[PDB]
From Swiss-Prot:
<dbReference type="GO" id="GO:0003676">
    <property type="term" value="F:nucleic acid binding"/>
</dbReference>
<dbReference type="GO" id="GO:0016829">
    <property type="term" value="F:lyase activity"/>
</dbReference>
<feature type="disulfide bond">
    <location>
        <begin position="65"/>
        <end position="72"/>
    </location>
</feature>
<keyword id="KW-1015">Disulfide bond</keyword>
<feature type="binding site">
    <location>
        <position position="7"/>
    </location>
    <ligand>
        <name>substrate</name>
    </ligand>
</feature>
<feature type="disulfide bond">
    <location>
        <begin position="58"/>
        <end position="110"/>
    </location>
</feature>
<protein>
    <recommendedName>
        <fullName>Ribonuclease pancreatic</fullName>
        <ecNumber>4.6.1.18</ecNumber>
    </recommendedName>
</protein>
<dbReference type="GO" id="GO:0004540">
    <property type="term" value="F:RNA nuclease activity"/>
</dbReference>
<feature type="active site" description="Proton acceptor">
    <location>
        <position position="12"/>
    </location>
</feature>
<feature type="glycosylation site" description="N-linked (Glc) (glycation) lysine; in vitro">
    <location>
        <position position="41"/>
    </location>
</feature>
<feature type="binding site">
    <location>
        <position position="66"/>
    </location>
    <ligand>
        <name>substrate</name>
    </ligand>
</feature>
<feature type="active site" description="Proton donor">
    <location>
        <position position="119"/>
    </location>
</feature>
<feature type="binding site">
    <location>
        <position position="85"/>
    </location>
    <ligand>
        <name>substrate</name>
    </ligand>
</feature>
<comment type="function">
    <text>Endonuclease that catalyzes the cleavage of RNA on the 3' side of pyrimidine nucleotides. Acts on single-stranded and double-stranded RNA.</text>
</comment>
<keyword id="KW-0964">Secreted</keyword>
<keyword id="KW-0255">Endonuclease</keyword>
<comment type="similarity">
    <text>Belongs to the pancreatic ribonuclease family.</text>
</comment>
Amino acid sequence: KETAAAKFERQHMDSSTSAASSSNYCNQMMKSRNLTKDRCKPVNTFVHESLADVQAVCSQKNVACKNGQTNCYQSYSTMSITDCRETGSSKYPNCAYKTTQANKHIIVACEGNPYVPVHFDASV
């Protein structure tokens, strides 16, 4: 039984690589992480930092979420991220993604106890 916290980790964490070097990164990770069942997940972000470092964001800069909520936090520093976005030729079950690597601050929504990231809001 997957919790909100577990789902965030499966969908967004990639501590095992410091960055994505291959144009094929997204294609592989999207499939490995169970993100292409029934439909191709259109957009997804992978974070190349330790789990503890991402969890620490929950006590960082409080910001408004894109939905108007107040339980969003922004990392003080930029972090290693990889953006996966479905291409214009992607067609389920043949999901195709464009891989974009960059250093951005992340914005996550936090909940519970312990207070941890449950949703990936944005990158800036």
